């Protein structure tokens, strides 16, 4: 077992990196998704093209929070200091 | 039974990750869903294409918060430090 | 009757997780529900399609807060450290 | 009687759990309910479909706070530490 | 006339419970009622249905703040620690 | 005369319980009132029904802040600790 | 002439109650009044029914802040503790 | 020339009460006044009815801040403790 | 000269009283005045009725800050403690 | 070159007075002037009336920030304590 | 060289007096400018009158931040204490 | 397993870099993509152009959060101090 | 080479002045510019009158931030104290 | 290795520089890019003119963050103090 | 390898200046750019006039952040004290 400052900072850091990490993307995806379904009702014929661009967008946004997830796991599993 | 700083942090870290980490995704899902039923109401014939594109979005968004859940479960059940 | 830091941290943590945890999803569910009723007033024939999609959405949002409910219940009944 | 740090944290925790845990669902129901009635005015023949779907959603949000309540009640009546 | 940390946290917690706990429901209700009177003016003939559903929502919202009151009262008249 | 922590926490608690207590309801009532007068201009014939539902609403909202007022007076006049 | 903590708090408590306690009600009244004169302008014939329903609202809202005023006067002129 | 805590607390308290105290009512009065002039431009014949209702509203809002002015003046000239 | 805690609090207090006490009325007048002129443009023959009513309201808000000013001036020139 | 708490609070208070004291009037004026130039474009023929009332409002708003300047100058050139 | 508290408070004060000082006017001017150019596109004939009233407005707003600038320079160059 | 201030600041900085750094891009992208799917529904025939420019923007925005990741990685895998 | 409090403040003061001092003016300029190109697009013939009135505004706004820049350069290059 | 206060400040500083420095430009690009595509949909023949101008602006904002990046990289790889 | 307060203050200061410094201008540039593209879609013939005005605006906003870049670079490479 270990318990210095760094271990403590590490676990908090981990949590913040995904907690704060998901706020922007959280909102972002909601926005895009909303527009796409509204679009799909307007032009059902256009669903595939829309579904396609939505996904491209959803990728980019989810990547942002995964960067936090990645940092979090380096801090818990591959921690460079403790 | 253990108690030090790192354990105290670990539990606060847990809650923040899962708590904070829900703010964005939750607002986002509400936005996406609202638009979809509004969509369905406009063009009922398009329900399926909407329900489908919506399930897509919801997963991406939900997954965002599931990253925080993961971090919490590690901190609680597979802690590297304590 | 133990009262170290980690017990006081736990109780605080359990509260935050489930309290902060409900903000986004509480708001979002309202957004979704609102559109659904406005929808049902516009196309009462589409009630069931609307109702089903809404019900699905609500579950997705309800989960988000349930993750904070699960972390809280571990911290109270399955506490790893104290 | 007993007045350690954990009993102190426990009272505050219990209050935070329901004080904050109501903000989200509090706004949410008001949005949903507002929509409902406005719809009922525009389309009175849909009252039962509206009212019904509305009632459904209302439950979901109400639960979001009842989770905070539950935690509060444990921290008070079934406290695991003090 | 006993005075300790736990008694101090108890009076503060009591107020925060009830006090913060009004913000959400207070706004939410205004929102719902605003729509109702607007609706009642658009379709006086629907007043009954509108009044009826409004009362339903009010109740659901009032109950959110009552939970805070409930805690406040426990902390002040059935405090488990002091 | 008395002056421990609890007396001090008590007086502050009292103030917050009504100060914060009135914010939500404060806004809420403004909203509903506004809509009702706007409604009354639109359908003067409908004034009684409107005036009726407004009042029902204004009750509910004022009750929320009175819960704070009640806590405040227990803290000043029926204080359980000091 | 007295000075301790509880007296120092009592005065800060006073101001907060009356200060904070005005924020909501003040915004709310502005909203209600604005709508009423706008109302009056639209349908001048309906002045009286508006003036009347408005006086109603204003009282409920004003009363909210008067609760804070009461708490302050007690803290200053009928203090239980100091 | 006394300078205990309670005198420094008083001066701070007097300032807050009258400063914070003016935020809501300052905003609200503007809201009301705005509608009133926009109104008078729409129905110059209704000027006096509008003007009278406005004048009444303004007084209600002005009181709110005057309560913070009264607490301030006690704290400076009728201070109970110091 | 003299530099106790109360003189220190007194300068800050005096500044807070007018710095904050202007925010509310500051926005309020701008809203009111904006409306006024816009109305005058739409309905120039109403200039005197507009301008007059506007002037009235402007006074009311201006007073809200003059209260902060008054307090400031007392804390500075007629200080009851230091 | 005297230096004490009261002199430090005096320089800070001076800046906050003038600095914070600009936020409200600054926004308010922009608002009022924005309407005026918009109005002057809608009805060039009314420029004179519009310019005239705008100047009135500007003055009322400028005076709010001047109060802060006034305090700033007293604290810096006629400080009563140091 | 000099370095007491006051020198330190002085330099910070200076910075805040212009930093915070420019926020309101910063926004304010943007608003007015925007409206004036929008106005100028609408009524090019009316450019001179508009350009005139804009400038009058821009003066007033810039003066607010100069009051901060003035305080800042008294603090750095004509500092009354240090 | 070294632990010092600099190592603690390093884990926290790493998380804040990536975590805070997502807020802007996350929202921005949602905004951009929301418009794209809306556009693709308005003019399916333009999908190609719309998709193409959207990808350009996404890239520019993704690169903003990547800078934070980059720092996070330096601090964690090429830390210059520890 | 010097180091004390006043020098440490001087550098933090510098950044705040130039950093904070850009917030308002930056948002304001964006607003003014946006409106102008929108203006130009509507009435291309009026470009010059817009470009001209815009340059005017931009200078006033930019100047606001230049006050903060000045304060920083003094603090760094012509410090009165250190 | 070395772990003074300046290395600690240096890591945090470097993270703040890019975490915060992205918020502004992050939202900005999303707004700009959203507009762009929406325009391209309405007016596909203008794609190259739109896309081009858009690209231009995108650079400008991207630079705003690259400045934070640059600072970060200096504080890390070319640190002037530690 | 010096590490006094003023070096740690410098590094923090450099970061803030350039990070906070980019918020307003980052947002504002987006606002301007958005209007410009929407504009170019409305009047592709006006592209060059629009494009030129935009380019001018962007430079004005870019400067604002460049002032924070200049203060940062002094603090790192031309530091007056340390
Ligand atoms: O006190 C002796 C210990 O001191 C060092 O760290 C000490 C340090 O001195 C002390 O300030 C620290 O308490 C500081 C509490 C800071 C709380 C902080 C708040 C936000 C970020 C996360 C948590 O505890 C450390 C425990 O290791 C060493 O790391 C440790 O090996 C050594 O035994
Ligand atoms: O200083 C006494 C001893 O304290 C150390 O740990 C101490 C540490 O220094 C101290 O800051 C800590 O109390 C600090 C309380 C901070 C509360 C914290 C804030 C946010 C995160 C959750 C809660 O207690 C530790 C108990 O493990 C170690 O036991 C030992 O190295 C050291 O000698
Ligand atoms: O009961 C004695 C225990 O002391 C330690 O905790 C100490 C700790 O050192 C001390 O800083 C701490 O006071 C620190 C107050 C921090 C407030 C904290 C903020 C987050 C939410 C909970 C409240 O009190 C503890 C009392 O137990 C250890 O946690 C524990 O191992 C040990 O047994
Ligand atoms: O021995 C006398 C009693 O003292 C203890 O409490 C002590 C405690 O150690 C001390 O930190 C405490 O001062 C701590 C001040 C904390 C302020 C608090 C923070 C959140 C809630 C509102 C305000 O004072 C208590 C005494 O009034 C114990 O709580 C109690 O069991 C014991 O009987
Ligand atoms: O260190 C002395 C005692 O420490 C513990 O409680 C101490 C604690 O350390 C101390 O920080 C505490 O005062 C510190 C202030 C606590 C603020 C906190 C903020 C949110 C949660 C509620 C209150 O007083 C307690 C009085 O018992 C335990 O009672 C026991 O380990 C030990 O007797
Ligand atoms: O210091 C001796 C006294 O200690 C206890 O309380 C002490 C306590 O120790 C001390 O931390 C406390 O000062 C703590 C100041 C906390 C200020 C707090 C901030 C927000 C909530 C309201 C006010 O003063 C109490 C005065 O009673 C007992 O209550 C008292 O009987 C005893 O005489
Ligand atoms: O510790 C010394 C003595 O202090 C006690 O009271 C002390 C108390 O402990 C202390 O925290 C307090 O100073 C604390 C200053 C906190 C400022 C407060 C914060 C928010 C509410 C308004 C202002 O002064 C009291 C004076 O009555 C009692 O006089 C006595 O029991 C004790 O022995
Ligand atoms: O003049 C000596 C007086 O000391 C006490 O107050 C002390 C107190 O103990 C001490 O914590 C206090 O320093 C505490 C600083 C708290 C700052 C406070 C925050 C709220 C707004 C006002 C400023 O200084 C007082 C100086 O008087 C008592 O209030 C008074 O009975 C006694 O006569
Ligand atoms: O004896 C030398 C002088 O010292 C006293 O002030 C002392 C005081 O006791 C002490 O708390 C003070 O440090 C207190 C630091 C408080 C920071 C302050 C908070 C708000 C306003 C801006 C920053 O230092 C003063 C000395 O520079 C008295 O104020 C003065 O009358 C006396 O002549
Ligand atoms: O305790 C020493 C002195 O305490 C009083 O003033 C003390 C006070 O206690 C102390 O907290 C204070 O420094 C404490 C910092 C005060 C911060 C406060 C925050 C907002 C209001 C303005 C500043 O310094 C004073 C210097 O005189 C009185 O001057 C006198 O009772 C006594 O001589
Ligand atoms: O410590 C001895 C010195 O004490 C006085 O001031 C001392 C004072 O005691 C001390 O609290 C102070 O440190 C207090 C640090 C407060 C930081 C503050 C935070 C916001 C406002 C700007 C900065 O340092 C002063 C340096 O002069 C006298 O001014 C000085 O002549 C004397 O030599
Ligand atoms: O107290 C020891 C000595 O400290 C004095 O200066 C001290 C001062 O007291 C102390 O608060 C200070 O450390 C205070 C650190 C506060 C950080 C500050 C907060 C915001 C503004 C930027 C950073 O260091 C000074 C070094 O010049 C003087 O050197 C001397 O008069 C005194 O005897
Ligand atoms: O001697 C052991 C080591 O201790 C020093 O660091 C000490 C330092 O003095 C002390 O203030 C520190 O406690 C300070 C707590 C500050 C909390 C911090 C604030 C922002 C970043 C997250 C949390 O503890 C360190 C020990 O763990 C040095 O940093 C290091 O070089 C040295 O080798
Ligand atoms: O005073 C002891 C040492 O002080 C300096 O660093 C000290 C410093 O004074 C102390 O406040 C510090 O702990 C204090 C907490 C610092 C918080 C800060 C907040 C944002 C920036 C990052 C962290 O620990 C250092 C450990 O080295 C220098 O290392 C050196 O002058 C000396 O050896
Ligand atoms: O290296 C020893 C140096 O000590 C002084 O600074 C001391 C100072 O007294 C002490 O309060 C300080 O700890 C204070 C911690 C304040 C944290 C601060 C917050 C703003 C951003 C940067 C971090 O540590 C310094 C360590 O150097 C002087 O600055 C310098 O003249 C002297 O040479």
| SS3 per-residue string spanning J3-32 | CCHHHHHHHHHHHHHHHHCCHHHHHHHHHH
| Cβ proximity of O19 and N64 under 8 Å | no
Residue K3 φ/ψ region, left for φ over 0, alpha for ψ in the -120 to 50 degree band, beta for the rest: beta
Determine, for residues A82 and L1 on separate chains, whether the beta-carbon distance falls below 8 Å.
yes
DSSP of L39-75, one letter per residue? Answer: HHHH-GGGHHHHHHHHHHHHHHHHHHHHHHHHHHHHH
Q: What is the DSSP letter of L44?
A: G
Ligand 5, atom 11, lies closest to the CA of D5
Task: Report residue E74 as tokens.
Answer: 């426990």
L79 C-beta neighbours (distance < 10 Å), count: 18
Report the alpha-carbon distance of residue C20 to residue B22 in Å, rounded. 8
Apex CA D57: angle with CA B25 and CA B31, to 5°?
30
Report the alpha-carbon distance of residue D50 to residue C48 in Å, rounded. 11
Apex CA G29: angle with CA G26 and CA G31, to 5°?
110
Nearest C-alpha neighbor of A33 from the set E65, I45, B59? B59
* DSSP helix/strand/coil, I36: helix
Report the alpha-carbon distance of residue M45 to residue N13 in Å, rounded. 49
Report the alpha-carbon distance of residue D44 to residue D39 in Å, rounded. 8
Q: Provide the b/e sequence for G35-72 (b: ≥16 CB within 10 Å).
A: bbbbbbbbbbebbebbbebbebbbebbbebbbbbbbbb
| M to O contact (≥3 Cβ pairs closer than 8 Å) | yes
| Cβ proximity of J47 and K49 under 8 Å | yes
Report the alpha-carbon distance of residue J72 to residue I77 in Å, rounded. 14
| Residue with tokens 């779907």, as numbered in its chain | D53
H25, H38, H41, best to mutate vs chain I, most I CBs in 10 Å: H41
Report the alpha-carbon distance of residue M31 to residue I26 in Å, rounded. 21
Helix and strand totals (H; E) in chain B = 2, 0
* DSSP helix/strand/coil, B53: helix
| SS3 per-residue string spanning E40-73 | HHHCHHHHHHHHHHHHHHHHHHHHHHHHHHHHHH
N1 C-beta neighbours (distance < 10 Å), count: 11
Of A7, A22, A34, the CB nearest to B68: A22
Nearest C-alpha neighbor of B71 from the set C75, A63, A15? A15
H7, H17, H26, H34, best to mutate vs chain G, most G CBs in 10 Å: H17
Closest ligand, as measured to the CA of M14: 12
Q: What is the DSSP letter of N22?
A: T
Apex CA F76: angle with CA F73 and CA F78, to 5°?
75
Nearest C-alpha neighbor of I33 from the set C30, D61, J34? J34
DSSP of F19-37, one letter per residue? Answer: HGGGHHHHHHHHHHHHHHH
The angle that helices O5-20 and N47-77 make with each other, rounded to 10 degrees, is: 180
Report the alpha-carbon distance of residue O77 to residue J44 in Å, rounded. 55
- Please provide the size of chain E in residues: 82
Nearest C-alpha neighbor of J38 from the set M29, I40, H30, K63? I40
Ligand 10, atom 21, lies closest to the CA of I9
CB of G56 within 8 Å of a chain H CB? The answer is: no
Apex CA G82: angle with CA G79 and CA H5, to 5°?
115
CA E63, E69, E74, E75 torsion-angle sign: positive
Task: Report residue I19 as tokens.
Answer: 């710095």
> Cα G13 from chain centroid?
16
Of L2, L15, L79, the CB nearest to A71: L15
Q: Which of H1, H3, H5 to mutate to test the pocket of ligand 10 (most atoms within 8 A of CB)?
A: H3
Report the alpha-carbon distance of residue O69 to residue K42 in Å, rounded. 39
Computed over its alpha carbons, how large is the radius of gyration of chain C? 18
Selected residues 18-47 of chain C with any CB under 8 Å from a CB in chain D: 18-38, 40-42, 44, 47
What are the backbone angles phi and psi of residue J81, rounded to the nearest 5°? Answer: -110, -35
All partners of chain G with 3 or more CB pairs under 8 angstroms: F, H
Task: Report residue F78 as tokens.
Answer: 């029926």
CA-CA-CA-CA dihedral for G50, G56, G58, G61, to nearest 10:
-140
Report the alpha-carbon distance of residue I31 to residue I52 in Å, rounded. 16
Report the alpha-carbon distance of residue F35 to residue G39 in Å, rounded. 10
DSSP of H1-70, one letter per residue? Answer: ----HHHHHHHHHHHHHHHHTTHHHHHHHHHHHHHHHHHHHH-GGGHHHHHHHHHHHHHHHHHHHHHHHH
| Cβ proximity of H26 and I26 under 8 Å | yes
Report the alpha-carbon distance of residue K39 to residue J37 in Å, rounded. 7
A76 C-beta neighbours (distance < 10 Å), count: 19
Alpha carbon of C16: minimum distance to chain B alpha carbons (Å): 6
Nearest C-alpha neighbor of C23 from the set B26, A21, E31? B26
D31 C-beta neighbours (distance < 10 Å), count: 25
Report the alpha-carbon distance of residue N3 to residue N8 in Å, rounded. 7
CB of M77 within 8 Å of a chain K CB? The answer is: no
Determine, for residues O81 and M3 on separate chains, whether the beta-carbon distance falls below 8 Å.
yes
Task: Report residue N24 as tokens.
Answer: 């502004």
Q: Is C56 exposed, middle or buried (0-12, 13-18, 19+ CB in 10 A)?
A: middle
- Kindly list the residues from chain A whose CB atom is less than 8 angstroms away from the CB atom of residue L28: 28
**If residue N70 lies in a helix (H) or strand (E), which one and from where to where?**
helix N47-77
| Residue with tokens 């808000």, as numbered in its chain | I61
Ligand 5, atom 27, lies closest to the CA of D4
The technique by which this structure was obtained is: X-ray
| Cβ proximity of O54 and M1 under 8 Å | no
Determine, for residues F28 and E23 on separate chains, whether the beta-carbon distance falls below 8 Å.
no
Closest ligand, as measured to the CA of B16: 2
What are the backbone angles phi and psi of residue F2, rounded to the nearest 5°? Answer: -140, 145
Apex CA K10: angle with CA K7 and CA K16, to 5°?
150
CB of A51 within 8 Å of a chain B CB? The answer is: yes
- Kindly list the residues from chain K whose CB atom is less than 8 angstroms away from the CB atom of residue M23: 22-23, 26
Q: Provide the b/e sequence for M12-42 (b: ≥16 CB within 10 Å).
A: bbbbbbbbbbbbbbbbbbbbbbbbbbbbbbb
Q: Provide the b/e sequence for H7-23 (b: ≥16 CB within 10 Å).
A: bbbbbbbbbbbbbbbbb
Task: Report residue J78 as tokens.
Answer: 């006629």
Q: Which residue of O has its CA nearest to M71?
A: O71
CA-CA-CA-CA dihedral for E44, E50, E54, E57, to nearest 10:
-160
Determine, for residues G64 and F22 on separate chains, whether the beta-carbon distance falls below 8 Å.
yes
I45 C-beta neighbours (distance < 10 Å), count: 12
State the first-to-last Cα distance of chain N, in angstroms, to the nearest integer.
11
| Cβ proximity of F29 and G60 under 8 Å | yes
Task: Report residue I61 as tokens.
Answer: 């808000």
The angle that helices A47-77 and L5-20 make with each other, rounded to 10 degrees, is: 170
Report the alpha-carbon distance of residue N82 to residue N77 in Å, rounded. 10
The angle that helices L47-77 and A47-77 make with each other, rounded to 10 degrees, is: 0
Could you give the count of Cα atoms lying within 13 Å of L25 in the half-sphere of its Cβ?
37
Report the alpha-carbon distance of residue D76 to residue D11 in Å, rounded. 7
Apex CA B32: angle with CA B27 and CA B33, to 5°?
100
Q: CA separation (Å) from N65 to A9, C73, J17, M29? A: 27, 42, 33, 19
Apex CA K16: angle with CA K13 and CA K18, to 5°?
115
Report the alpha-carbon distance of residue E15 to residue F68 in Å, rounded. 7
Report the alpha-carbon distance of residue I24 to residue A69 in Å, rounded. 43
Cα of M8 to ligand 11 centre, how many Å? Answer: 13
Q: CA separation (Å) from M51 to K40, M55, N79? A: 10, 6, 44
| Cβ proximity of M82 and M7 under 8 Å | yes
> Cα G74 from chain centroid?
16
Residue I30 φ/ψ region, left for φ over 0, alpha for ψ in the -120 to 50 degree band, beta for the rest: alpha
Report the alpha-carbon distance of residue I21 to residue I56 in Å, rounded. 20
| Residue with tokens 């109603």, as numbered in its chain | G56
What are the backbone angles phi and psi of residue K2, rounded to the nearest 5°? Answer: -140, 145
Domains, chain N, with CATH or none: 2-79 (1.20.20.10)
**If residue B66 lies in a helix (H) or strand (E), which one and from where to where?**
helix B47-77
Task: Report residue M61 as tokens.
Answer: 């706004």
> Cα L6 from chain centroid?
26
DSSP of M34-71, one letter per residue? Answer: HHHHHHHHH-GGGHHHHHHHHHHHHHHHHHHHHHHHHH
Task: Report residue M42 as tokens.
Answer: 């509507």
H15, H44, H50, H66, best to mutate vs chain I, most I CBs in 10 Å: H15
Task: Report residue M22 as tokens.
Answer: 């850009």
Report the alpha-carbon distance of residue G33 to residue N59 in Å, rounded. 48
Q: CA separation (Å) from L5 to A6, K66, M68, N72? A: 8, 42, 33, 19
* Pocket of ligand 11 contains residue K9 by CB under 6 Å: yes
Q: CA separation (Å) from H12 to D6, H19, I12? A: 34, 11, 8
Nearest C-alpha neighbor of O60 from the set M59, H43, N78, G32? M59
Report the alpha-carbon distance of residue L48 to residue L46 in Å, rounded. 5
Determine, for residues O3 and N82 on separate chains, whether the beta-carbon distance falls below 8 Å.
yes
Report the alpha-carbon distance of residue N48 to residue N50 in Å, rounded. 5
| SS3 per-residue string spanning K12-73 | HHHHHHHHHHHHHHHHHHHHHHHHHHHHHHHCHHHHHHHHHHHHHHHHHHHHHHHHHHHHHH
Report the alpha-carbon distance of residue J31 to residue J25 in Å, rounded. 10
> Cα N31 from chain centroid?
15
| Cβ proximity of E18 and D16 under 8 Å | no
| Cβ proximity of F67 and E23 under 8 Å | no
Report the alpha-carbon distance of residue I35 to residue K32 in Å, rounded. 14
Ligand 4, atom 31, lies closest to the CA of D3
What are the backbone angles phi and psi of residue L3, rounded to the nearest 5°? Answer: -145, 120
D65 C-beta neighbours (distance < 10 Å), count: 32
Determine, for residues G41 and H39 on separate chains, whether the beta-carbon distance falls below 8 Å.
yes
| Ligand 10 pocket at CB < 6 A | H 3; I 4-5, 8-9, 12; J 5, 9
Report the alpha-carbon distance of residue A18 to residue L13 in Å, rounded. 14
- Please provide the size of chain C in residues: 82
Nearest C-alpha neighbor of O15 from the set M12, M26, N63? M12
B1 C-beta neighbours (distance < 10 Å), count: 10
Report the alpha-carbon distance of residue O36 to residue O27 in Å, rounded. 15
Report the alpha-carbon distance of residue B19 to residue C14 in Å, rounded. 10
Task: Report residue B18 as tokens.
Answer: 């899962």
Closest ligand, as measured to the CA of H7: 8
CA A40, A45, A46, A52 torsion-angle sign: positive
Task: Report residue C36 as tokens.
Answer: 């659904």
Q: Which of J3, J4, J11 to mutate to test the pocket of ligand 11 (most atoms within 8 A of CB)?
A: J3
Nearest C-alpha neighbor of G74 from the set I47, F17, C21? F17
Task: Report residue G67 as tokens.
Answer: 């609760």
What are the backbone angles phi and psi of residue H43, rounded to the nearest 5°? Answer: -140, 70
Q: Is E77 exposed, middle or buried (0-12, 13-18, 19+ CB in 10 A)?
A: exposed
Cα of N81 to ligand 6 centre, how many Å? Answer: 44
| Residue with tokens 């019904």, as numbered in its chain | D52
Report the alpha-carbon distance of residue O39 to residue M39 in Å, rounded. 8
Report the alpha-carbon distance of residue O17 to residue O20 in Å, rounded. 6
Report the alpha-carbon distance of residue K76 to residue M74 in Å, rounded. 8
Q: What is the DSSP letter of B45?
A: G
Determine, for residues G57 and F62 on separate chains, whether the beta-carbon distance falls below 8 Å.
no
| Cβ proximity of A69 and L22 under 8 Å | no
State the first-to-last Cα distance of chain D, in angstroms, to the nearest integer.
11
């Amino acid at each position: 077992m270990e318990s210095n400052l760094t271990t403590a900072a590490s676990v908090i850091a981990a949590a913040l990196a995904v907690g704060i990490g998901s706020i922007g993307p959280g909102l972002g995806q909601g926005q895009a998704a909303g527009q796409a379904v509204e679009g799909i009702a307007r032009q059902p014929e256009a669903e595939g093209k829309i579904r396609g661009t939505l996904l491209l967008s959803l990728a980019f946004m989810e990547a942002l929070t995964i960067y936090g997830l990645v940092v979090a796991l380096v801090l818990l599993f591959a921690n460079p200091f403790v």
